[PDB]
Write a protein that binds this ligand. Structure first.
Ligand code: NA
Ligand code: NA
Ligand code: NA
Ligand code: NA
Ligand code: NI
Ligand code: NI
Ligand code: NI
Ligand code: NI
Lengths: 836, 836
C-alpha cells in the first residue's frame, strides 16, 4: 500500500465518519464529535468520486445534517468543518461554513458511499449555549484621555493602501496625502487590530489619537524616529519634504480630546458583544463554563480599552507599535499570552500573561511602554517575544492529580491531554502492589521511575510504602527520592504503622497519605484518628467507597489535622453510581455475590448515603481536593471534568452558595478549581512552584475554549513551552483540518520535557543530590512545609463540620443536620463531547 | 473532533467489534478475541443509545453470544468482558460476567447498531479446556505441627470487624472480647489470605494456631510487641487491661496441636481444587499448556501450606505479618513474585521468586522469618518490597532469539510483546544485505546500532560479516563490538572463508553462525564439514529450507562440533508448509516458474522429507535451538509458539517420549523450552547472565495465564522491572477494561531500558571500553566460553544420530532408520487466539 502517515490518519477519520453514519442511520441525534467526523468524511468521499469542485462541496457540506439530526448544542458548537482530500487536480482544502443550516439534512448525501439504508426523517426523536458570553447591552469607549484630530486622507497611489490601528500615522505610505504635521505622534482611533483601507483615489476622513506612554516613535519609514517633541517634529517635517511623502496642510482640521462622552465626535465606540468577539470578555461580562450551569463573571480587567495586544497581519504587535523597539534585550518577555480570561482560586480576571525563563513573570497589561500607558517593565513585548493568542479563551493552572497509581505510561498521556501537568502518587508499573496502592517501594524502583519519567513534560512526585512499624526502611525510600509515603490497608494500616509513619514524616517534612482499615480489624475510625496524635495527614478517598473504615471514615472531614481528598468515580452521585461501584468492588476484591459475608462486606463499603454526603461536603468546602485513583478505582482523564460535574450538580440541586453573588457563580467556581490546583500543591509541599496562575510560579498553563471548558482543552503549556495541543492533519495547508486530535508537541521530544519540569523529592534526597546520582535532566526540588498544615490551610475548602454517621443506617449528619442530595440522572461535560 | 487518546482507542475497539459482527453475520463461530471485541463494542453502543442502565447492560451482555456462535474453547476462556462508556450520567464501567450463558444468543442484540442482516441460527456449523488444572480429589491440611486453641470470640462493637489469616490475634480491635492470654502468639487457622467476619454482637468460635519462625510479634496495636515469651506475655496482658481491650478468661477452651490427621478438630483443610484457585497448583497437580495437548506436572513446591504469600486487603503481606518488620533494610527484596509455577529446563516447580538489584536473588519460600518457618534471609519481604502476584500463572525465562535480522525496529516491539527479551543477530535496517543476512558489516554501523538500541529494554548482540578469506577486517568488526560473525552464502560460504572465520573465532572467543553453500558451488556438505576442522560452529536453519547445501545440509545434526538450530516457519510440517515455502523462496530469489533450472533449484531446496525429518530431529533432541529468521524467512513473534506447536504435533503423532512419565509431558516440555532459553545463551556465550530461571541471573521473566501459554503473555519483566504488559483503557477505573492490548511500560521510557539490560560484545571490544567510546547507558558484558562447546553441551538436546540423506529421493534416516512424520492439518496456539 505504501501508506504515508496522512493516509493512515485519514483512514481513522473515515472510520469515525462511518460510525457516525451507522448511528445516524438508526436515528441517533449526533453529537458535535460525530457530526464533524461525518461531514469531514463525506467531503473526502465526494472528492474521491471526482465529480464535484471545492466550491460545490463548500455548499454540499451544509446540507448533510439538519438541526433534527444533531443534539441541541451542535449548531452552537459547530461553526465550521475543514478537511483536505485528493481531488482530480490534487490535494485541496474544503471548509464547510455553518454546516447545520436546515431543519432536516439530505440524508442520502449524509450517507453517500456508506451503503447504509437512509432513515425516514421521523426516526429522529424530538437547550443552553455552551460557553456563551453574556454582556450588558452597551458601548465601551476607546482610547479615552488623548489628544485627537480629524484629518482628510487622500490616496494618490495606484494600488490599495491599508493602515493598522497602531501604526504611527506620519510613517504611512508616501502616496497618502494629508496633514503630516497634525499626524505626528498620532495613530488611528479605531478598534485595536483593525485597519482603514484606501483604494486608489479614495478620500476618507479619519480620527487620530495621540500615542501615549513615553511617546516615542520608532520604525515605519524612519520619518519621525524619536521621542515626540518640537525638535523631532521639525526634523520629521524636513524628512517628509525631502523624501516626497504626501503632505498638505489642513489648517481647519477639527482638534480636541477623547473622553467619556457618548456625543464627542472624536470618540470611537465598540459594543460589548463585538468587544468580546475580538478580545474576549471584560469586566462584568459572564461566561458559561462548558455546557454546565455555572457562570463566571470577569471581576477586573487590566486592559486599557483600545490598546489591546492582538497579533496578526496589520495588527498591534508589530515593530515600534505594540512590540517595543529599544528596551534592554534581557527584559523582553519570552512569551506573552494575550487577552486571557484567567480562572484561578485567586480570582476570575482578564489580563495578559508574561512568561520568562519558564516562569509566570507578570500578569497584567502587556505591550510597548513607548506608545501605551500602563505597561510595567516586566510586561514588555520585544523582538524576541513569542505570542500565544488568548483572546476568547480561558486560561487555568495545570491540574495536579495527587492520587496517581503509576500502573502504565499511557495514563500519563491521558492525564496531560486532559489538562493535568503534575502527578503525585506511587507505583512501578502494573505489578499487583501498584495496582492496589500508590507505592514505589524499593529504592531501586524509585531510581528507575525517576529515570523512566525524566523526559516526560510533567512534574512528578513518587511516594513510598509507609506501612511499617519501624522507621528504618522508611528512611531509605525517602533518601532515595520519595516525597511522601502511603499507608494502605493492603500493606497494613494499623495504629502501630500509622504512628511510626507519622513520626517519620515529622522528621522528614513530607506528607503522609492514608487509605485506612476498612475491615476495622485493629480498630474503628476513632482509633486511627487517635493514632494520628494530632499530626498532619492526607486522607485519600475520604468518603470511603475507594477504601476506609466502614461505614464511617468520612468522619475525618471534620478533623482539624486532616487534609481530606475525594477520588473521582463517585463524583457526583448519579443514577448508575451504586450499581457500578458495587460491581467494581466485587471485581477488584474477587468477591462472590452468592456468599453472604462477601456481599455484606460490599454493602458496608459502597453506600449511597455517604456518597451523597460527599457531594455536599465537597460543595461546602469540607473536602479540599479531588484526585483520580488512576486505574485503581478512578479515572486519570476525569479529575477536572468530575470536579465541574460535582459543582454543576450541587448548583442545580441547592442553588448559589451562601457566599455566592446571584449574578454569578464565582465563589463556587473558585472553591472547586482549588480542589485540583492549589490544594494538592499545598498538601504535598510544593505550592511555591505550581498550583496557581501567580507570578513567580512555573508557567504550567492550560488554554480552553469556553464551550469546551472542563472537558477538552486546546493547548497545554508546560514550563512556558507547548507540551500537548489540538492539531489536525499534519500534511494540511493549515493546522485545523480533520482529524483534529490532542497530540504531543515539541515539549515531548528529546530531553525538552526535563527542561520544562520538576521532579519533587524529599529534602533528604536532595541533600545527597539524587538528581546527580541518577543522571536526571529534569530539575529537582525538595518538598517542604507540610507538617504544620491543618484543614484551615486548604484554600476555600477549610470547613470543619462535626460529622456523625449512624453505624446501622449510614445516615450522615454535619453539625447535627442531615446531609442529603438526590442522585442526578445526567451530568454535563459528557454526552455533548465524547465519541464513546 | 478534538479526539482524546481514549476516543481514538475506543474507535479501534469498535472497529474490531464490527469485524466480529460481520463475521457473525455470515455464520462464523467467533474466537475468544472476536467475542470480547463484539461484546465490549455492543455495551458501548447501548450506552450511546442512552436507554439502558449499567445494571441492565450487565444482563444484556450475557445474551449476545451463545455457545453455538463461538468456538468450543470460548466459554472456557471468557470469564468476563469489561468496558467503559459515556452514559447520560457520565463514564461508567460495565462488567459482563460469564457472557456465554445460553445455547444461542439474541443475535439482533449482538448486531444492534451494525445495520447488518441477522443470520438464522442454522448458519452456525456444528473440545479441551485450555490451561486446565488437573488435581487429585483430596484435601490438604493447613498449618501442621503447631500449637492450637479454640476460642469463643464476641463482638461488642457497633460496626463490623473482619480479621485476616495472619493478623496477630491479641492485637485485634478492642471491641472483640475473648481470652487474650490464650490468643497471645497465635493467629487464625484459616486459608492464607482469607478472613473471619464479626457483625456487631456476633459470637463465633475460632481456631487459632501459633505463629512460627522466630515467633516475634510486631505491629497491630503494639499490645504485644516483641518475641513470644513469658515476660512479654505478662507485659501484653498488662497492656490489654490498661488500654481496655476486651478480655475474658476462657479456662476450659480446647487446646492441642495440628498434625496430619483428618479427624483432628483443630485442623483446617482445603481441597486441591480450591487451593489451586487461590494459590495456583501444587505438587502432583497438572496444567495444560495453552490449548495444546501438553500437560506439565508440578514436581515440587516450596510452600508450607497455610503460609502462602498473598497480597491484598486483609491478606498475608502486611506489616508485622507476611511483611517483615525489623530485618536490615539492605536485605529486603526489591520485588517478590508470589506463588509462581516456574517452567524451565531445570524443572517444573512451584515457588516464590525474589528479585534484588535486577537479579533473581532467590527461588523458594518467601515471607517473614518472624512468623513463618522456612524463610531464608535472602527471601525476606520488607517495607521496601514490591509484589507481583504469580498465583495461578506460569513464569518462564524471557526467550532468546538468536537468528534476528535487524530489518526494522518494529520487529523488536513484536518480539518483546511475544515474550522475547534477548535478540542476537545482525543488520543495519532494511538494506539488501540485512534483508538477506544477519550481518552488521561496518564498525560505523556497529556503533550506530548499539547507540540506536541503547534505550530499548532488551539484551542485544550484533554479529558481523564473517564471509572473508582474510582475518584483517574481521578483527576490526569484532573490536568494534561484534559478539559473533555470520558466514552466509550470499557473501560467500566457501571453505576458504569458513576456515578463516573459524580461526578468528578461536582467537576471539565468539560464536560463528553459518548459512552454507546451497548451490554446492565450492563443495558438497562434507566439504564444508571438513572446513570446520572440528571447531565449534552454530548452523542456522539446519534443515535447509532457510538455506544450505542441497539437499543434505541436515546431516550437520549428527556432527559433534555443530550446534544446530531450526528457524520457525517450517515448524512443524503442516498442510500448507510446502506450497507456502516454495512460493516464498521463488519470491525471495526472483525465480521464474516457467524456467526449468529455476524450478529445479526451488524443488532442491524446499523438501517435504527434510522438513518432516526436522520435526523428528527436534523431538529427539538432535536440533538444539529454535529461532526466528525475522522478516528473512521467519517470524519474530512466533519463536515461542512454533516451538510449542512442534512439541504438540510430535506428542500427537508419536505419544510420550521414552524419557517421559506417562502421567505428564515434563521431559518433552523441558527439552523444548531449552530450545529458546538456555541453549541460545550457551551457544552465544552469555548463559551466566540469562537463559533460565536460576539464582544470580538477570530477572528477565515472562508471566503467562496457562490458558494463553505459548501465545500471548500477560507481562514481560526485564531486569526486574515491567517492560511490556497487557493493559486496557488508560482512562478506565481499573486496568482491565477494553481494549486490552500488549503495551510498553515504564521500562521503555527515558533511559530506563538501558538500566535493565545488557549489550553483549566481544572481549576485544570490552577491552577498549566500547561502551564508553560509544556513550552507551546499557550495561555491556563480553561473551565467553564458546570455543570448546559441542552438541553435548546443548541442554536436553544433545543427540548425535548418524544422518543420511538420499541424494535423489531426499529420504532421511537417523542411525539407519527412516525419519518420517505426516503433515498436520491443524496446530494449536493459533485459531483460538488471533484476530487475523
Ligand atoms: Na438529575
Ligand atoms: Na455497621
Ligand atoms: Na540431488
Ligand atoms: Na493433523
Ligand atoms: Ni485507596
Ligand atoms: Ni488508590
Ligand atoms: Ni540463512
Ligand atoms: Ni537469516
Amino acid at each position: 500500500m505504501k501508506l504515508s502517515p496522512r493516509e493512515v490518519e485519514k483512514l481513522g477519520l473515515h472510520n469515525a465518519g462511518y460510525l457516525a453514519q451507522k448511528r445516524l442511520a438508526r436515528g441517533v441525534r449526533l453529537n458535535y464529535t460525530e457530526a464533524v467526523a461525518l461531514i469531514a468524511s463525506q467531503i473526502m468521499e465526494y472528492a474521491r468520486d471526482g465529480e464535484k469542485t471545492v466550491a460545490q462541496l463548500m455548499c454540499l457540506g451544509q446540507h448533510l445534517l439538519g438541526r433534527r439530526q444533531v443534539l441541541p448544542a451542535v449548531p452552537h458548537l459547530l461553526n465550521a468543518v475543514q478537511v483536505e482530500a485528493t481531488f482530480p487536480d490534487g490535494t485541496k482544502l474544503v471548509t464547510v461554513h455553518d454546516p447545520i443550516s436546515r431543519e432536516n439534512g439530505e440524508l442520502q448525501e449524509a450517507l453517500f458511499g456508506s451503503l447504509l439504508p437512509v432513515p425516514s426523517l421521523d426516526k429522529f426523536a424530538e437547550n443552553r449555549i455552551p460557553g456563551e458570553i453574556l454582556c450588558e447591552d452597551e458601548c465601551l469607549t476607546l482610547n479615552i484621555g488623548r489628544k485627537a484630530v480629524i484629518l482628510k486622507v487622500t490616496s494618490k497611489g495606484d494600488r490599495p493602501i491599508q493602515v493598522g490601528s497602531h501604526y504611527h500615522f506620519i510613517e504611512v505610505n508616501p502616496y497618502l496625502t494629508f496633514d503630516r504635521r497634525k499626524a505626528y505622534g498620532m495613530r488611528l482611533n479605531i478598534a485595536a487590530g483593525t485597519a482603514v483601507r484606501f483604494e486608489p483615489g479614495d478620500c476618507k476622513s479619519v480620527t487620530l489619537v495621540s500615542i501615549e506612554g513615553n511617546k516615542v516613535i520608532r520604525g515605519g519609514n524612519a520619518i519621525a524616529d524619536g521621542p515626540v517633541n518640537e525638535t523631532n517634529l521639525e526634523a520629521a517635517m524636513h524628512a517628509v519634504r525631502s523624501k516626497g511623502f504626501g503632505h498638505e496642510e489642513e489648517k481647519d482640521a477639527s482638534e480636541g480630546f477623547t473622553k467619556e462622552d457618548p456625543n464627542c465626535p472624536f470618540n470611537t465606540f465598540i459594543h460589548r458583544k463585538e468587544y468580546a468577539n475580538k478580545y474576549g470578555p471584560t469586566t462584568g461580562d459572564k461566561i458559561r463554563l462548558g455546557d454546565t450551569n455555572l457562570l463566571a463573571e470577569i471581576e477586573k480587567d487590566y486592559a486599557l480599552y483600545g490598546d489591546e495586544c492582538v497579533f496578526g497581519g496589520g495588527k498591534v504587535i508589530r515593530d515600534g507599535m505594540g512590540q517595543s523597539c529599544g528596551h534592554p534585550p534581557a527584559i523582553s518577555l519570552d512569551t506573552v499570552i494575550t487577552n486571557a480570561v484567567i480562572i484561578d482560586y485567586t480570582g476570575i480576571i482578564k489580563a495578559d500573561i508574561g512568561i520568562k525563563d519558564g516562569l509566570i513573570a507578570s500578569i497584567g497589561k502587556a505591550g510597548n511602554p513607548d506608545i501605551m500607558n500602563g505597561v510595567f517593565s516586566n510586561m514588555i513585548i520585544g523582538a524576541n517575544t513569542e505570542v500565544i493568542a488568548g483572546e476568547g479563551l480561558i486560561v487555568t493552572a495545570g491540574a495536579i492529580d495527587c492520587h496517581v497509581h503509576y500502573i502504565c505510561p499511557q495514563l500519563v498521556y491521558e492525564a496531560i491531554s486532559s489538562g493535568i501537568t503534575t502527578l503525585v502518587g506511587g507505583g512501578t508499573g502494573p505489578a499487583a502492589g501498584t495496582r492496589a496502592t500508590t507505592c514505589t517501594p524499593s529504592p531501586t524502583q524509585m531510581r528507575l521511575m525517576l529515570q523512566s519519567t525524566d523526559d516526560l513534560p510533567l512534574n512528578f512526585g513518587f511516594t513510598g510504602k509507609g506501612s511499617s512499624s519501624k522507621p528504618d526502611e522508611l528512611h531509605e525510600i525517602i533518601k532515595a527520592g520519595a516525597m511522601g509515603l502511603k499507608l494502605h490497608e493492603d500493606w497494613g494500616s494499623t495504629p502501630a504503622a500509622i504512628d511510626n509513619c507519622l513520626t517519620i514524616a515529622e522528621h522528614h517534612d513530607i506528607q503522609i497519605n492514608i487509605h485506612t482499615d476498612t475491615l476495622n480489624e485493629a480498630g474503628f475510625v476513632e482509633h486511627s484518628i487517635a493514632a494520628f496524635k494530632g499530626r498532619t495527614i492526607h486522607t485519600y478517598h475520604s468518603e470511603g467507597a475507594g477504601g476506609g473504615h466502614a461505614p464511617d471514615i468520612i468522619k475525618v472531614c471534620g478533623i482539624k489535622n486532616v487534609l481530606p481528598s475525594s477520588t473521582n468515580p463517585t463524583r457526583p452521585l448519579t443514577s448508575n453510581t451504586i450499581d457500578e461501584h458495587l460491581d467494581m468492588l466485587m471485581v477488584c476484591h474477587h468477591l462472590d455475590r452468592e456468599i453472604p459475608e462477601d456481599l455484606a462486606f460490599a454493602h458496608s463499603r459502597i453506600r449511597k448515603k455517604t456518597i451523597a454526603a460527599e457531594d455536599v461536603l465537597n460543595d461546602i468546602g469540607a473536602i479540599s481536593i479531588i484526585s483520580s485513583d488512576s486505574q485503581a478505582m478512578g479515572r486519570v482523564g476525569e479529575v477536572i471534568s468530575r470536579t465541574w460535574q460535582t459543582a454543576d450538580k450541587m448548583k442545580a440541586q441547592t442553588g448559589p452558595l451562601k457566599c455566592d453573588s446571584s449574578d454569578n457563580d464565582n465563589f463556587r467556581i473558585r472553591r472547586y478549581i482549588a480542589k485540583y490546583t492549589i490544594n494538592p500543591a499545598i498538601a504535598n509541599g510544593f505550592s511555591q512552584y505550581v498550583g496557581s496562575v501567580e507570578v513567580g510560579k512555573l508557567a504550567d498553563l492550560v488554554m480552553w475554549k469556553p464551550s469546551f471548558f472542563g472537558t477538552k482543552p486546546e493547548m497545554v503549556i508546560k514550563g512556558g513551552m507547548v507540551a500537548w495541543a489540538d492539531i489536525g492533519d499534519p500534511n494540511a495547508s493549515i493546522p485545523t483540518p480533520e482529524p483534529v486530535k490532542m497530540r504531543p508537541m515539541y515539549g515531548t521530544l528529546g530531553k525538552a520535557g526535563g527542561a520544562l519540569s520538576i521532579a519533587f523529592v524529599s529534602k533528604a534526597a536532595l541533600d545527597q543530590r539524587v538528581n546527580v546520582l541518577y543522571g536526571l535532566n529534569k530539575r529537582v526540588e525538595a518538598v517542604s512545609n507540610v507538617r504544620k498544615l491543618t484543614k484551615l490551610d486548604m484554600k476555600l475548602n477549610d470547613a470543619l463540620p462535626e460529622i456523625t454517621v449512624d453505624p446501622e443506617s449510614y445516615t450522615v449528619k454535619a453539625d447535627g443536620k442531615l446531609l442529603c442530595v438526590s442522585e442526578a440522572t445526567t451530568v454535563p461535560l459528557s454526552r455533548n463531547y465524547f465519541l464513546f
